[PDB]
Amino acid sequence: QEESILQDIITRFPNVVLMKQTAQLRAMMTIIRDKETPKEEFVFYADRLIRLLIEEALNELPFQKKEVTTPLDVSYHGVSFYSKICGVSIVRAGESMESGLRAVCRGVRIGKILIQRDETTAEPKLIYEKLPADIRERWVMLLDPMCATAGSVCKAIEVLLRLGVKEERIIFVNILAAPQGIERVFKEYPKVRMVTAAVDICLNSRYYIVPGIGDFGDRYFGTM
Amino acid sequence: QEESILQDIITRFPNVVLMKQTAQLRAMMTIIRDKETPKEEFVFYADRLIRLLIEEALNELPFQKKEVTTPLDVSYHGVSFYSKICGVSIVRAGESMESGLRAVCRGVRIGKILIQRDETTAEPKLIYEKLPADIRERWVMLLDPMCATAGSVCKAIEVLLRLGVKEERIIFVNILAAPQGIERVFKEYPKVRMVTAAVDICLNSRYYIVPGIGDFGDRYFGTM
Amino acid sequence: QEESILQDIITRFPNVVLMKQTAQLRAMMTIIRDKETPKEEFVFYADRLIRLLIEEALNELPFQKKEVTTPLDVSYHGVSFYSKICGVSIVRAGESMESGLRAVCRGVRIGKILIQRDETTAEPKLIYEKLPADIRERWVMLLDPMCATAGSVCKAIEVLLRLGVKEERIIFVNILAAPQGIERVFKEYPKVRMVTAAVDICLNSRYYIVPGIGDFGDRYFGTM
Amino acid sequence: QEESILQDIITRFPNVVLMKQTAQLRAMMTIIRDKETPKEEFVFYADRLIRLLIEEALNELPFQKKEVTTPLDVSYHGVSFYSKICGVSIVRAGESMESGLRAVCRGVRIGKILIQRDETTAEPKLIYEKLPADIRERWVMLLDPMCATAGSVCKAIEVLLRLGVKEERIIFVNILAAPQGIERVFKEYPKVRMVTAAVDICLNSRYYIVPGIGDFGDRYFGTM
Ligand SMILES: O=c1cc[nH]c(=O)[nH]1
Ligand SMILES: O=c1cc[nH]c(=O)[nH]1
Ligand SMILES: O=c1cc[nH]c(=O)[nH]1
Ligand SMILES: O=c1cc[nH]c(=O)[nH]1
């Protein structure tokens, strides 16, 4: 049951960051998981959560000590964040998250990766990709709301790596995850970071997280 | 010069609707076309322009007529749009306009179509598509910022039609066009509606619109 | 009656610009005028309309001509707005419009003016005001969704003029007017410009425009 | 020293909730604090912060327990919120927060109150107010970014109280407070909750918090 879970993975996996389980967060989660929630509502709530999620994830970056001088002509000591970053959406669901990134980071560069599992073989292949030219030089915020089998995010990381990105500079921004998924990611790429809002029980006979949220891209974009 | 072309198209193509050429619109247009514009300014201004464009476009739908009684307790005669719609973006460039549609139309279903020209052969092939199941019964707001040779959009309409959408129900939303694209669209699919913001002079050697904007998707997403 | 009324204003006051009467514009108005409209919807649509209305009025500002060079190394000739502006809202209903204004012109300075119709008489009286320092030198986007008697706005212009604002530099943005309010404004301040989206028939003994919208401020902020 | 002050506030007033001092939060405050920051920049960050702050405050509301069933047919146990709420802004600075509140609570009723400290002396006097009439029955998101002497928020509290709002039903949303201010709020109305994002060191002869931000109202509204 729930509490065990978070305890184990939080314990076993030091690079995942779970968002504070506030009442609001649960409240939001409650609406988005409800199979009865109408489309307009699902996207309103998803977007909100998502913004919180990114603000959370943003803390994962390197920063500057910075001293400022206030209007009172007095000194203040802050921080300044300096890394070159960019967002990389996993098509199609991760796209739903680009909006929020763009909301807090205006004009961020946005890479895209469409990955698909063979209809027969089940193997995940890189179908299409469009990424910044110097991505090898920046911190990447990988976006995909779901991590069931870790099948998809793993292929994505793989390709980013072949492009020259450092494993430690990738920030996997997820909304919901299964333990399996979390383990695989760390198994293959222990140096990445993962921020998430929820970890569920397990995967369905069908490979669907449970109790879960269903097909996210479907409920978000309205193609269900 | 331009007024001619404008005239010619306005005359020869009854289904196109060029938008109001205001000094505001041109001012936006000048910012977005400038090679010197920074990604942030570029996205802000395109976003704004896009909003205006979607507003224009939505006027292309069928609407009822409606009497309402006001707080002053006197009836009022207005209209109501009663059709079932959805937006269909042409990946990737058409994606920048999804935000705008969602902004005026909360929770409108978003279909996606990825068309790509064979790298040897030059032709359009449908690569990926994820659309609404009842699309055959809806009004399609097709999104694609640019219309140079009309290759993409044309392949996009074909697929839509094989699914069952009514040709006269497709509303091709565009920012910038080149006369021949318009021409081609219309030779092949005469019953579609097209709303756009600018019509440019000619295409270039590279099939780039001129004086144009450059590569829209690259400038909007930052994979410059 | 409407047309005849619209045209007459139009022919009668060269300085008033009347928003384009699109079916969408009417759809929007019908929902906001409907007595039966829920508060969340009313704000949604009101905001929707405000954005278009604001975009319209911005066309009344001055501009230079600018030729830029496209990414395709070819010149484009557009224009640019060089102009120090600011919005001034009339508390409290006009505050519902500053959002729209801040949405299109980032960090635009905003002044506020609170006027109160005296209880004995009803002579408008200035309760409070906080405006830019250098306002004498700016174009003013004066904000007030309703213009019944024009008592509030005329008083507002009065003070603006007292501070040094040039009359011809005031752009009065509004959503709904009564012919009677229009006449007073231009009779008193012939040199200002006024952009509206609708003109209604009469005013009541309670000074409510009819068929009208009811109390805007209460409807928008939810204080019925 | 901050810690000290911070922890000491924390240990002393069971009822205040400080926002988690993330590096992000400090980066934001750093920008908005620098005298050197530009108008549009100040507003962008101030707004970004405010939204986080509001999400924080919303967790002070009461919630039910709720169970729904997932699209996969397995139940989930969430927690519904369900109370009549509303925001009340202290003009003019607090109105800078209504947007934030309106962003997450669609069409939330907004009340406004404007208070002036009488020159001569210094007792704030109520200048104007417009509130829901349903208010004695609601939870109130009282908004005011700076809390120096606390003279204003206490006066607002005083009128809300007079109107019949239950003291323990008032959530005071703040950005920067001064201990002295916090102290007066609790000595006068201890049953209230206060959510802030920062606690500075001292108030000065002209009553400005230090290191502080300067005048919030005019920096955000640009009337400085
Ligand atoms: O539960 C899951 C797993 C993968 N993708 C989804 O949308 N849902
Ligand atoms: O000019 C053109 C042609 C195709 N795609 C673009 O973005 N621009
Ligand atoms: O009808 C009217 C007239 C003035 N002000 C309003 O809010 N409504
Ligand atoms: O520092 C201060 C104190 C009060 N009000 C402000 O705007 N700033």
Side-chain angles (χ1 to χ4, degrees), chain B residues 93 145-149 176 203 206-210 212-218, chain C residues 72:
Chain B
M146 311 250 129
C147 189
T149 80
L176 208 221
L203 236 31
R206 218 298 214 165
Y207 313 97
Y208 271 108
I209 301 205
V210 203
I213 212 139
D215 187 284
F216 197 95
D218 270 14
Chain C
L72 285 112

Side-chain angles (χ1 to χ4, degrees), chain A residues 19 144 162 166 194:
Chain A
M19 282 185 91
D144 196 358
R162 86 125 163 284
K166 320 266 56 130
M194 171 179 342

Side-chain angles (χ1 to χ4, degrees), chain C residues 16 77 90 112 135 176 209:
Chain C
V16 4
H77 288 97
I90 289 168
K112 279 130 160 342
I135 198 165
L176 198 231
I209 299 160

Side-chain angles (χ1 to χ4, degrees), chain D residues 146 148 207-209 213-217:
Chain D
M146 317 266 92
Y207 312 92
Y208 278 114
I209 297 165
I213 120 275
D215 195 290
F216 195 85

